[PDB]
Structure formats: C-alpha cells, structure tokens
Amino acid sequence: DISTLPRVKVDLVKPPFVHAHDQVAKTGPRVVEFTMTIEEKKLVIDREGTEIHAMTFNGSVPGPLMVVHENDYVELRLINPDTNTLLHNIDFHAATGALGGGALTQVNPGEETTLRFKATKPGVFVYHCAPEGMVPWHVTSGMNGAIMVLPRDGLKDEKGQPLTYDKIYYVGEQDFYVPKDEAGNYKKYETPGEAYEDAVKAMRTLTPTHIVFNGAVGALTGDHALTAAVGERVLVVHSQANRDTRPHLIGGHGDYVWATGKFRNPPDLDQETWLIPGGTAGAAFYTFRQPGVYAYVNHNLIEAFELGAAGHFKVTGEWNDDLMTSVVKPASM
Amino acid sequence: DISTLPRVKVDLVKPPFVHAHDQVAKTGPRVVEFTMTIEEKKLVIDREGTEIHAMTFNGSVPGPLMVVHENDYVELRLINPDTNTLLHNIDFHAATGALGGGALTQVNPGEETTLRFKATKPGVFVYHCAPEGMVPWHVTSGMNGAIMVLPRDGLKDEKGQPLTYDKIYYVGEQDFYVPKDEAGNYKKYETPGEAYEDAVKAMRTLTPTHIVFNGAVGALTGDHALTAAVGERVLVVHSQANRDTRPHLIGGHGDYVWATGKFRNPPDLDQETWLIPGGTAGAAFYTFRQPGVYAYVNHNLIEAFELGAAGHFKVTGEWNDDLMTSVVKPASM
Amino acid sequence: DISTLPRVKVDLVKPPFVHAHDQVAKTGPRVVEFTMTIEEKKLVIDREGTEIHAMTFNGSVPGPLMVVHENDYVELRLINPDTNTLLHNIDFHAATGALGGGALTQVNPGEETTLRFKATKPGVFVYHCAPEGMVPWHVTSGMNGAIMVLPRDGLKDEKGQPLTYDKIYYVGEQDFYVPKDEAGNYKKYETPGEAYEDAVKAMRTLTPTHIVFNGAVGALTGDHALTAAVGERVLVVHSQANRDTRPHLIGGHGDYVWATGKFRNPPDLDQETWLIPGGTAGAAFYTFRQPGVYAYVNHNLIEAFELGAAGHFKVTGEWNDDLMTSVVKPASM
Ligand SMILES: [Cu+2]
Ligand SMILES: [Cu+2]
Ligand SMILES: [Cu+2]
Ligand SMILES: [Cu+2]
Ligand SMILES: [Cu+2]
Ligand SMILES: [Cu+2]
C-alpha cells in the first residue's frame, strides 16, 4: 500500500516563516519526508547577554513548523550528530502510539533514525523531545516546535465557508528557567550536563526567568517584526509546550480562533485574547484593517513586557478614519 | 456620513453598577460620548490598612463599565488633570488600530484628548492604560476596566432565542503586587514614582500579594453584597486585565457563559466554573432559584479566601425544598 | 412527590474505579442514596516518605466518584465520627442553593446529617469541603471529589449520535502545600490543627510542593496503571478543585472532550491537551488504537515529572504499523 504512494521531500524554513505548501490538498495522500538535525548550542536570550545551553531541532528555538495534510504519512529522518552530548528523541502530539513516537526515536550522539506515522487528525500540534527521566529539561531548553495537519479541503469558518490565508507565521513561545546565584546573577556553564542539577532546582520554582518568542527577547521586533498589509488574511500559529499562554494582538483581534488548535472544531470568533494551554498549539486568523505597528503579546503584561513575551507586526496601508480617529489630539486643558 | 447620527452624552456609574441602557437597540447607530478623568490616589486595599498608589479611570478600581451597541461610535474624552504626576493613555480591546487607541491618547498631567472608534465587534472587552515602558505597572495599579458592546438585537442563547437580564453587575478582579520589607511588612510610599523600582521587583515574582474584586478585600460583602431575588435573570460581567481567573457562583451555576466574552459565539451551558484568560472580559447569565447567601469567587480557593477574590450575593425569595433539603429520617419505605 | 419514587442504595468504590451504573436510564427519576464517612488521617504522598494530615471523604484522596442521572435526587448521609478533630461539611457544584449544600451540612466529630438535592444539570462536577474560615485548607488537604450526572439518554457526540464507553476511570488531581523549614525539609505534625498556621503560610505562596494523581506520586504507575485494550472506548473523568490543570495522554488524544465537563455542550474533538480550570471536573473520551504504555499527565511537564502529576495506561493488543512504524531503528550514522 505505502510502497505505492507518491513521496515528497520538503525543504524546511526557519521560524517565524513556513515552508511551501498548499492549503487545499491538490493530490491525494502522500508520504511527506522531512529531515531535522539536533543541535545543542549556546544561545544569548536577552539584551544583558544571558547565555544558556539550548537543545534544538534544526538549530532554532522553536524547531521549524512542519505542514502536511490529513491522512498523509509523515516520515522524519532524525539526526543526532556526534558533536552533541545528550541522547534525544522526538514525540509528536499528532501521532498515535509509542509515546507520540518518543519511544521509537531515542538517538545518542552519532546516531539517526527514521520514523513514520499517519497524520490522522487535523490541527496544529506540538512536538518536543522527551527523554525518559529528563523530559522537562529538554523541553524548557527550547527542544520543541509544531506541526500543522491541514484538512484536505483547507480551513473553514463557523459556517463551513472556506477561509484562505495570504500569510502564515509561526510563533513559538518558550519559558526559560535560568539558574541564579545568591545576588541574582544568572549562571553560565561549560556544557549542558554541568547545568542539569541547577536547572532542576530552578524549574521546581515554577517561575520562569524569561518567557520569549522565537528564542530571544525582542526576537520578533524592530527589523524582525512580522509584516502584513491592510486587507491581508494572516494565520498565526502559536505554541507553548510546557506552560499556559494567552496571546493577544494589541490593536487587532482574533477573527477566527482555534485556541486548542483542532480544525474539526468550529473556530471562536472575535477573540480579544485566547488561552492556549501548556503542551498545545493554537491558531488565530485575522485580516488587517488598519496600518501601523501592532504588538503581539502574552496578555499577562508582566510576562509580556518584563519577561520578554512580546513581538511586533508592521502593517502597511491607508488609515481608516471611520474605524478610529483622533477627534482632539492631546493638548493642555 | 457620521454627522447624520444622533449623539448622546452618557454619565458613567461606579462599579459594580452600570449606567442605564437598552439590551435591544431602539435606535440606529449613534455616537456615544463618555468622559473619564484620570485620578492617581492612595487606596486602602485590605483590613490591615495596606495602602497603595492606585492609578484610576474616574476614581475607581476597576474603571466604570461602558455599554454601547454593535456599530455605534464611542467618543471618549480622556482628561489627565495637573494634580496627577504620570503620563497615561487608554487602549480598548474593542477598538481597531493604533494599539487599541493607546498610541493616540497619550496625555501628560494637565492634558486631555478625545478619541473615537467604531465598536465593530459584539462582546465585553477590556480597556486599560498602556504607557510605553510601564505597561504592567499602570495596569496592576488598577488602571483598567471594561466596555460591553451589545448585539443590536440583544443576547441570544445556544438556540438563537432571546436572553433578557433583569440585573447586570460588573466585577473587576485586580491582582496587586505590594512590596514588603525583610520581615514581610507592606511598604508605603509618598508618590507613585517612589514605588516604581520596588513595584517592578514585586511584579517579576509573578505572585500577587492581593487579588481583589472592586478594589479591596471584601469590597463586595456585607452591606455591599450584590443583590437579587429568586426568579431574576442576572448578568455578571467579569474582567481581569492581566491575570487568569476562574469565576464560580457557590450554590449556583453559570447557565449561559461567554468565558471569553464574545457574543457572536454561542454560550457554554451549565458552567460550574469558567476560565477567563488574563487580558479578557467574560460574562455569565444565571437565574436565581434559591434565596440565601451566595459567594462569588475566583475558584483557586487560596486566591479567593486568602488573597481576597471573594464577594457575596444576597438573594431574597422562597426556599425550594424540591431542589434541596435537609432530610428527616423517620421511615424505611 | 418524592415519597412515591424508587430508592436505590449505592456502595461507593475507591478511585480510580467507579461504582456500577447505567449510561442510559432504564427507569424514571430515582432517589439514589450514598453514605460517606469523613476520615482525617496521615498520608504519605511521595517516595521520600513525606507525610501530611489528609482530610478525606471515605478514606481516599480524592473522594469516590458518585454517578447519577439528570433529575435524580441525590441523598447523601454524611458522617463525621468522634475520632476526627475538625468540623467538616460538603459543597456539591451540582446542587442549587445553600452554598451547594455546605450551609446545611456542617458536622462536628460525633455528628451526621443527610442532605438531599436534585441533580438538575448534566455533567461532571466537583464536590468539596468548605468550612467557613478554613476552605482552602480543607480542600488542599485532599477533601474533594466529583459527581457525574449523566443525561438520561447517555452521552452524545458533536452530531447528537450516542457515545458509549466500555471503561470509566476517575483521576482526581491534588495540589499539596507541605510546609518546610529553613533548609527545605518538610515538616511533620502530630495533629491537623498543629499544622494550620504553617499550612496557611505555605498556601499563600501559590506554589505547590506536590501535585499528584489519586493521592500520591506514582499512585497510578507500575502495578496501579490504568488498563485498557486496543478497541476499547474509555472515559476519563478528571477533577481539580483548586488549581488549573491541562491533562494530556502521551501517545493518544482526547477524541471527544468536555474540558469544562458539562454535557449539554458538544465536546471538543481531537484534543491533544485541554484545560480544566481549578474548581472544575472535565471528561475525555478516547478509543485506544495502539497497544503499549501511555502516560497520562498534566502537560506542564515540570508539574508532571518533577512534582508528581503523572500516571500510566497499560494497553493490550496488536501493534498497528500503518499508524506508526520505525522505518530505520536508531543506528550509528
Ligand atoms: Cu532532547
Ligand atoms: Cu507532550
Ligand atoms: Cu496609566
Ligand atoms: Cu491589552
Ligand atoms: Cu473538611
Ligand atoms: Cu467550590
């Protein structure tokens, strides 16, 4: 059966961008092939130079967004180069069995494996490393991403009418627990393992030191702000593999929101803020109506502005005074 | 096109009360004018005289609930008198563009401004101050409220049938982060500015020292309990501009609940407890069936009974023994 | 009216198991009688021998799951033996009035009472102890459980079609706040009262020391794993009377989920992870498709693997290669 299906090799693109794909499946079920290389590396996560030992899928935090269609077969070739120090694996929340595939993909440095699973359920799911015994350590070190299993007929609204996005962005939110000394100074380590004991202790506090989008504070701001234009329909895939988050686009709304990211369910309309539970990936659909800067944040303002969970959207177009206008600009009474 | 619309000036009421308004709109779209004066002031939040420098809209925490209908234009005159010391502005989650209006309403002490926006989406929304650089500080200082945008044809239940409320109450939940000294005693400051450095440190722990309704522990209890009678349909608007909450009516339920506050979505039925994400406003509809005292709480019992998130409802009427009764045991058949 | 109704006595079972019941009602309304004895006792919650004074309903944490049909009358005889030292009561989120029954059920050691209430709304609900003044303390000491009110015609899917489970398990999640000394060593006390002052100080941190399923770390692991077979439809009722949780079945999903547990609402399909707000009980329906070990966890992985919120499912049956297969077993590059 499988021996007969057409295969397609996909070339991944780094977040917040997504690889080429069709919203509406143009062919029948296929075997979509992906290859990802694990990479342990030092990452500066804020302006003050705080450094950590990140464990990543394909060199990024989060790992790249993988897109397939319902009933396609995902075949992932996972490589763990001998330059790494730890054993890793991969568990897909979209798969059924073997701990999401984690029990069949344990690879030590210098090893690789190829797993195949059927994407039987449509929606955006989280995937993360989950080694027996150090699950939370690998996930909170950035070893997680997301996979989108689109319905063969694309997205539909609350009434079943097709929804087509012009742009799609992937925002992976990551909660970090960086160890500190007595004074409050962040620790630095030579290798990941050296950091383990202090890491566990920091994690148990349940209070992150950093909460960031795309691997670093301000990673999606300035020259890296997400772009769009008035009239464009944008889909924002947001994931959090360990902690709850409440996404909010300041100045806009979530026209169609699948807070828990599962497409067979009708979307919630006109959301100002929605809650995505830890270990879940959700999606929001919006059409820009006003130009200018928008802030995409975690609506716990402390977590957004103090801890780093804030990004930007730079939108181009003409201002609509009907929707909003300054009747009297600020001036002395 | 707008000059042909009727303009009406509304006087805001202090929470938990709401100004008069029609659930089913009797007129076509209008320009509803509101005026709010910013007031920075000391506020006693608990029985132990703990005092803070509250930053308020119209002198209260939360600010008053504004009610308009879908497609009406909201025209707000925001005044910042010279007696204040900080720059403030206003961001509406109901508005489209310019950071919710925040970018267009920055007013220094002694300034004022008038903003207008079209309420294009029905539901209850959060509005809060959001100054560049000190967003979480103004919000956790009580500078937030809500605005309800009623569908022109009123509320509808899961099956499109009319839902009419006899009473409406606005409950604004506020998380405070008061700084303490080495022992745990709450600090007092002369001006808001003086508190700033300590406030930031307190916020970063992500652990509130108080969580209150209507700005103080027990603000909604005793002589201030919310009232109703058996048979009355009551709508309870609940907002939390920065932190998750999970409302619950002890001894009752939320017959029709819009946990994320957007009316185009069908309500959730028979809710015991619902989650309202931080940065969101929600609404619950319930018909009282039993007289007595009811406790309205944030169902993280520690937050309700230790930190302050608990209020009362005093309902009058006749007891229904078929619903509940203390059993008398003189029988075997 | 009640006098002429059929009465059926039911002997409760210890969690994760549930007493015998019918999904679809074969009779009209009934008076279902239950008896619960309150037991204050020492409990060891972790592998390190940590001990606490648990306050239980029927000797377990959580209390047994009670199951009735919509419109049945629940008659509960609550006994507080003279061996206990504290006053207790019970509050059902399923009942209407008198604070869910708490106002009618206060019993000191040596007293008992019988409460009757109509189960007017279908769904799974939380019930817990709530003595005026020490609510959080009693709930966090393990005094909570859940009651399931089935629609008279059983469960239905999104399209109104019948849903029949073959097995039902009850998982009560508990957040514990064990007091610690200067070094971080857990305290031990002679009686519940001795622990009060410290317990309050530990609760106010809002940070659990333990978060466990069925009363202790590993209560649902090893020889205690929940069991099923490929092809069986399982319903997992999950409750959390005080804090938010986000269940997830690693290697599986929630085919039909009632996150907030109220059956008049349609279930959410294909959930990977769902949020159950504190003070709520939810239910997930799943049909096992692959054999092997599955981990049922709270998807805040730190909470699951460090604090204790993790359990197992051992499923029997034949492996399905179409759903998942290891194309190339881990091997040296
Ligand atoms: Cu790993
Ligand atoms: Cu997972
Ligand atoms: Cu302000
Ligand atoms: Cu906001
Ligand atoms: Cu008790
Ligand atoms: Cu309760």
Q: What is the 3-state secondary structure (H, E, C) of A204-241?
A: CCCCCCEEEECCCCCCCCHHHCEEEECCCEEEEEEEEC
C238 is catalytic: no
- State the CB neighbour count (10 A cutoff) for residue B34: 19
End-to-end CA distance of chain A: 78
Q: Which of C240, C290, C296, C300 to mutate to test the interface with A (most CBs of A within 10 A)?
A: C300
Say if residue C143 carries a ligand binding annotation.
Answer: yes
- The Cα C68–Cα C23 span in angstroms is 9
CA of A303 to the centre of ligand 4 (A): 13
CA C229 from chain center: how many Å? 23
CB atoms A97 and C290 under 8 Å: yes
- For B249, which residue in chain C has the nearest alpha carbon? C99
Those residues whose C-beta lies under 8 Å from the C-beta of residue B97, and which sit 6 or more positions away, are A251, A289, A290, A292, A319, A320, A323, A324, B117
Helix or strand or coil: residue B265? coil
Smallest Cα distance from B144 to chain C, Å: 24
Q: Which residues, 6+ apart, have CB-to-CB distance to A251 below 8 Å?
A: A290, A292, A293, A294, A295, B95, B96, B97, B98, B99, B100
Q: Six-digit token pair at A124?
A: 């955006």
- Strands A167-176 vs A210-213: parallel, antiparallel or unpaired: antiparallel
Distance between CA A297 and CA A6 in Å, rounded? Answer: 41
Q: Match 């209908």 to its residue by tokens.
A: B69
B27, two tokens: 């007129």
Q: What angle do CA B248, B253, B257 make, to 5 degrees?
A: 85
The edge-to-edge listing of strands for the beta sheet with C66-69 is C66-69, C144-150, C123-128, C91-92
Angle ∠(B110,B116,B122) on CA atoms, nearest 5: 130
Give the determination technique. X-ray
| Tokens, residue A325 | 């206008």
Q: Nearest-CA distance from B164 to chain A in Å?
A: 22
In C, which residues are within 8 Å of A100 by CB distance? 250-251
Alpha-carbon distance C210 to B205, whole Å? 20
To which residue do tokens 């986000």 refer?
A: C246
* CA dist., res. C147 & res. C100, Å (int): 13
Are A97 and C320 inside 8 Å of each other by CB? Answer: yes
Q: How far apart are CA B106 and CA C15, in angstroms?
A: 58
CA of B55 to the centre of ligand 3 (A): 6
Return the structure tokens found at A316. 């181009």
Q: Are A303 and B206 in contact (CB under 8 A)?
A: yes
CA C87 – ligand 5 centroid, Å: 7
Ranges of H-type helices in C230-318: 301-305
B93 appears as a binding residue in the annotation = yes
Counting Cβ atoms within 10 Å, is residue C10 exposed (0-12), middle (13-18) or buried (19+)?
Answer: middle
Handedness of CA B281, B282, B287, B292 (dihedral sign): negative
A88 is catalytic: yes
Question: Who surrounds ion ligand 1 at CB < 5 A?
Answer: A 55, 88, 129, 138, 143
Domains of chain B: 1-151 (2.60.40.420), 152-318 (2.60.40.420)
Between the CA of A139 and the centroid of ligand 1 the distance, in Å, is 7
Torsion angle of C-alpha atoms C327, C227, A244, A145, degrees rounded to 10: 0
Please report, as a single letter, which amino acid is at residue A152: R
Q: How far is the CA of A273 from the centre of ligand 4 (A)?
A: 8
- What stretches of A109-226 show up as alpha helix (H) in DSSP? 135-139, 192-203
Q: What is the Å distance from ligand 6's center to A254 Cα?
A: 32
Three-class DSSP category at C161? coil
Q: Which residues make Cβ contacts (< 8 Å) with residue A5, sequence separation at least 6?
A: A29, A30, A31, A73
Residues 243-282 of C with CB under 8 A from B: 243-244, 260-262, 264-265, 275, 277-281
C330 interfaces chain A, CB cutoff of 8 Å: yes
Q: Which ligand is nearest to the CA of B54?
A: 3
Instruction: Determine the distance separating the centroid of ligand 4 and the alpha carbon of C321, expressed in angstroms.
Output: 48
The answer to the question of whether C333 is labelled as a binding residue is no
For chain C positions 280-319, those within 8 Å of chain B (CB to CB) are: 280-281
Distance CA A263, CA C72 (A): 37
What's the CA gap between A271 and A268, in Å, rounded?
A: 7
Q: Resolution (in Å) of the shown entry?
A: 2.5
C142 touches chain B (CB under 8 A): no
Question: Could B272 and C261 be called an inter-chain contact, meaning their C-beta atoms sit closer than 8 Å?
Answer: yes
The reply to whether residue C264 touches residue B275, judged by beta carbons under 8 angstroms, is no
Its sign, for the CA torsion B134, B138, B141, B146, is negative
- Interacting residues of A48 by C-beta distance below 8 A, sequence separation 6+: none
The Cα of C293 is separated from the nearest Cα of chain A by a number of Å equal to 7
Place of tokens 């960031």: A212
Distance from CA of C115 to the nearest CA of B (A): 5
Q: Which token pair is A250? A: 């300041």
Question: Which residues in chain B are closer than 8 Å to A324, comparing Cβ atoms?
Answer: 95-98, 101, 104, 115-118
B97, B205, B262 ranked by CB distance to A269: nearest: B262
Work out the minimum CA distance from A311 to partner chain B, whole angstroms: 13
**In whole angstroms, what is the distance from residue C250 CA to residue C88 CA?**
38
A253 a catalytic residue: no
Amino acid at C178: V
Q: C67: CA distance to ligand 3 center in Å? A: 51
Question: Is A143 assigned to a binding site?
Answer: yes
Residues of B in contact with A253 (CB under 8 A): 93, 96, 121
Bridge-based pairing of strands B210-213 and B167-176 is: antiparallel
H/E run at residue C139: helix C135-140
SS3 C224: helix
Residue C187 is classified by DSSP as P
Determine whether the interchain pair A294/B99 forms a contact, defined as Cβ–Cβ distance below 8 Å: yes
- Spatial separation of the C-alpha atoms in residues A108 and C247, rounded to whole Å: 30
The whole-angstrom separation of Cα C155 and Cα B277 is 29
Q: How far apart, in whole angstroms, are the C-alpha atoms of residue C233 and residue C287? A: 4
In terms of Cα–Cα distance, which of C183, C171, C250, C181 is closest to C211? C171
Among all ligands shown, which has an atom nearest to the Cα of A105?
1
Q: What is the largest CA-CA distance in chain C?
A: 77
Which of B209, B260, B325 is the mutation pick for testing C, counting most C CBs within 10 A? B325
Size of chain B, expressed as the number of residues it contains: 333
Question: Would you call A329 and B110 a contact, using CB atoms and an 8 Å cutoff?
Answer: no
A19 is catalytic: no
Hunting for tokens 């919000």 — which residue is that? B139
Nearest alpha carbon to residue A234 among A172, A123, A155, A125: A155
B224 labelled as ligand-binding?
no
Q: What is the dihedral of CA B71, B72, B73, B76, to 10 degrees?
A: -130
Cβ atoms of A116 and A73 closer than 8 Å: yes
Nearest ligand, CA A296: 4
Amino acid identity, position C166: D
Compute the nearest-CA separation of C63 from chain A (Å): 27
Is residue A210 part of the annotated active site? The answer reads no
* CB pairs < 8 Å spanning A and B: 168
Cβ of A273 within 8 Å of Cβ of B277? The answer is yes
Active site residue C143: yes
Separation in Å, CA C196 to CA B242, B304, C144, C173, C215: 31, 18, 18, 22, 20
